[model samples]
Target: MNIFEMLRIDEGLRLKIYKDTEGYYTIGIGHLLTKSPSLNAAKSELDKAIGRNTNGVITKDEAEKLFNQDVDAAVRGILRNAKMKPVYDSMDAVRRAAMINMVFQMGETGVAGFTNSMRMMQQKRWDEAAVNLAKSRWYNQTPNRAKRVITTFRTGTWDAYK
Candidate 1:
């Protein structure tokens, strides 16, 4: 199997908020929480990750590798969510991708919490599902992102934001 497939199996592909072995709030493959950098050097690394003037802690290539790994895990979870299986099997590729993206952002349970939306999706009510998705706390928290994903759900197009 490829490296990504291997990682998917090895990481066990979690899609919910979980604590790591060391009690760090981690999600997706192994995205550890490293928000509070105590030292100056660590702060510099954060700045680099945020595109500041610094050599950065991790290189762009390394960041991409980590992102791909996490996404692989999320995809695994998406495939495993039984409630979403019908939607996954019936929806077009773009809608499937949007579902995966939603799972990646909110974890499987969080996405599953959109009861009405999922029901709409399973029933092929694309427009209703898109509207239901917009009427959520997530949408209020991130309007721009919600719009993009909602648009995808409504139009069955891959209008994902970069």
Candidate 2:
């Protein structure tokens, strides 16, 4: 079965998927999803997924392998459903991945529910994006997780694995 079938992530969740050097498929659960999976393995998986490449350059094959699921539509749904078509259309792959990472953790409904943050993105108010991001229930409930993702979104650093 595919990773999606195995994980049953039909709607997306906040997690990364990767295969190690040894070719074992693993999932990366953000700080918030720690209680849902093995945190150490998830960290190791995310580290390998990003690889030694610092530019966030991942091949389509790699992306598919890592996701091990049908992610194209999942991502499209995120942008479409969030009413972020314009922004989503202009963002680079990495930024799209960043947003996907957020949705993967929260699901479309959960992520889109951040009404203020969505509005901020619509207005291209980047600094406000950070603030609105931090105001979420996830931030209050899972500071470590929120900090990791928000930092990634802000800095383009893949330290979320660490």
Candidate 3:
């Protein structure tokens, strides 16, 4: 019904590690358990996150809190892209959430690479924007999730998949 539910569905909450699309160790609603700099760092973070370190996983509330942290980060990251910020702001809330999902899966720099798609979306050309999305490597990597997001963007409704 909203971004919260949409991401809960999309991320498919997991207590244990479920390696992300790129095979990075992830736990608790897509939280990257794999360390960016070192595995020990990741272990320490996970330990704190779950409050017990080794194999403790996490509770629903902890996972939910981390998801909120992630969602907020994705939203805030868009500010760095001046081009994306205005375009994102002008879009519908559903489509805006869809964009956040994209940014969630791929970093802000990754989404920013879609210059053509951005311009198309900037112009409000829904179908054309989605066509570019389909043509992306990300679309092929995770078709099920990407398709739903693309449809959300194209159709201008998060419920399009429903």
Candidate 4:
């Protein structure tokens, strides 16, 4: 159960152009290509990279190809943080995934703001990590997701890798 694959599911994917007005030509989650004309180069290059050949409708596979970029971007942001680098690198692969998932949900800087939890995680204080996470509005708001992610962190295992 690769974290990237599962987190892709965690965040909903959109390939079918929804009846929702903004959905047309939107690629992978919320990337709006409606104005690709404004800076055609970036969109044009991405279209080439993703092998987009359809008229306005990007293929489902291409949607995933573009979606994976966000997961990879999330990875880079987590790895780039000086404080997070050591702590993040020290973990086992499964735990690493949980960390990355959390980082993806909260932007890198937002997760970095988890100073207390970061210290606890680095200390391998598993329960304390969950404890700190539990004491947050984010956890309160996304109860189910927070539970699964922290559970993974606590046990150093995979969760609902659906």
Candidate 5:
């Protein structure tokens, strides 16, 4: 499945696309974005990662190879935590988009496995919710991105409802 399509960005996310990322570029499933490998170099690296598996999805292992230190820190920070677990549990399109965007900026483990923040989400505290989401190693790593996504989540305008 196309993760982006699954996230279903509306105008808000469109703005986020423009503000945070390098614009609308194609991304394969489980493809990790990085700065060190560069886009082209990362693609070449990913080619080897896919190996015989050619379903257009990159696995976690493949992602690890391409993932930079920043990404690794983000993923690890979240995975070991508990508060952020509900964010993963949320199946809503907006929540999913937020989750993916955070993980993309941070890493799957970092954003999803946070301790204090994840607890807030499970408690359904929306405002401080984003605060916890923002309080990450990635906070300064991608400031604009973190702000945009937290705003989207707080406002509940990241996606149109089904």
Candidate 6:
């Protein structure tokens, strides 16, 4: 199957917007409705769809397109954050995915604010990076999720939260 199909299966397609596991507004195959211009555009699309019919819902094809666009922007954001890119690029796929996921959730500028953690990561000090990450406000706000990311950063393993 194609990557879009795989993502649809993995993320579960939803025509209607709903709160995701993290309580963020989401729809159309795990598209997190953050406050980005991209999200504003998605909101406009959703509004148009809903305006067309009171109970209008997007198609799987629409969801796939939105998901692709969102992910593409997120990758660009990750790459554009110069402070995070060097360390982010040096990691293996699993570790890179963890960082990318964080950047996706936090926004590029927000993720780049983790100065101490990023600095430790750039220095290849895994333990220090993990500790610094855990000490951050992000960790305090989302301990369980942060732990998984911290562990992945420290050990280079894909131990995502269950």
TM-score of each: 0.66, 0.51, 0.89, 0.73, 0.49, 0.71
Error of 3 at 102 (Å): 0.4
Candidate achieving higher lDDT, 2 or 4: 4
Report how far residue 127 has shifted in candidate 3, in Å.
0.8
What value of lDDT does candidate 6 attain over all alpha carbons? Answer: 0.69
Please give, for residues 56-84, the per-residue lDDT of candidate 2 as tens digits.
Answer: 23444554455544355457677577365
CA lDDT, candidate 6, residue 157: 65
- Model 4 C-alpha lDDT per residue in residues 1-162, reported as the tens digit of each score: 887665765656676433223223445654435433343444564566567644445666777766677678879998898989888998899889988887776678778888999889999999988888889987887778788888888988675554
Positional deviation of residue 15's Cα in model 2 after best superposition, in angstroms: 15
For candidate 3, give the lDDT of residue 12. Answer: 90
Off by over 4 Å in 6: 1-14, 20-24, 34-56
RMSD values, in order shown = 9.9, 12.0, 2.1, 5.0, 8.7, 4.9
lDDT, residue 34, model 5: 37
Model 6, 1-162: lDDT tens digits are 233432344467788777676566677877765433454555665766434432335677777777878667777887776777787787777667677667655778778888888878877899988988887878887777677678877887644432
Best by lDDT: 3
lDDT of 1 by residue, 24-121 (tens): 44444555535343344444544544465433244545445566866777788877878777778888877777777677667788888987888889
Model 5, position 28, has a per-residue lDDT of: 33
Off by over 4 Å in 3: 35-41, 48-56
**Worst window of 10 by summed lDDT in candidate 2:** 27-36
- Candidate 6, position 38, lDDT: 56
Q: What is candidate 4's TM-score against the reference?
A: 0.73
* Superior by TM-score: candidate 4 or candidate 5: 4
User: Model 5, 11-115: lDDT tens per residue?
Assistant: 222110012343322243323333443555545544555465333345444433443443445445545546544455653556555665666554555554566
Who is ahead in TM-score, 1 or 6? 6
